[PDB]
């Protein structure tokens, strides 16, 4: 059903590897109550298998919030 609907409606339709740079941006603003920090490294692409173990690695580091009961 979806395929025939697409053929009905969507038939009338038309037929740069980025460079990771180690750097920093510091927006110093002492008026803000809390400091936000985000630190990253060059990761893999979507098709790279290494995405699977790396997520596991992140799962080991985990996440925390002040409202967590753990």
């Amino acid at each position: 059903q979806l395929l025939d609907l697409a053929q009905k409606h969507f038939s009338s339709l038309s037929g740069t590897p980025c460079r990771f740079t180690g750097s920093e941006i510091r927006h110093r603003d002492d008026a803000l109550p809390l400091a936000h920090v985000a630190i990253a490294v060059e990761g893999p692409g979507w098709a790279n298998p290494d995405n699977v173990p790396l997520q596991v690695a992140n799962a080991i580091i985990g996440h925390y919030d002040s409202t967590y009961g753990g």
Binding site: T21, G22, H27, D29
Partner: protein, 79 residues
């Protein structure tokens, strides 16, 4: 007391940096360094050198005058 975190209050200042492994340790060392050295030398040569030039003049005169003093005086041995 004196630690990063409470030294001063600064707002709305954005700083951009680069990894030391992404940049050259000697960027334009001579193309821009040499003109900069000349600028710094020119700004200071008329405030540092003149006092030392006076010392050299005094040093030369003192050395010469001391030599002349030890030299024989012909008039003293006249008659």
């Amino acid at each position: 007391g004196r630690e990063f975190g409470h030294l001063t209050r600064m707002r709305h200042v954005i700083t951009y940096s680069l990894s030391p492994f992404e940049q050259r340790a000697f960027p334009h060392y001579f193309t821009k360094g040499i003109p900069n050295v000349l600028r710094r030398t020119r700004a200071c040569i008329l405030r540092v050198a003149p006092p030392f030039v006076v010392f050299y003049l005094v040093y030369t005169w003192g050395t010469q005058e001391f030599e002349k003093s030890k030299r024989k005086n012909p008039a003293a041995y006249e008659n």
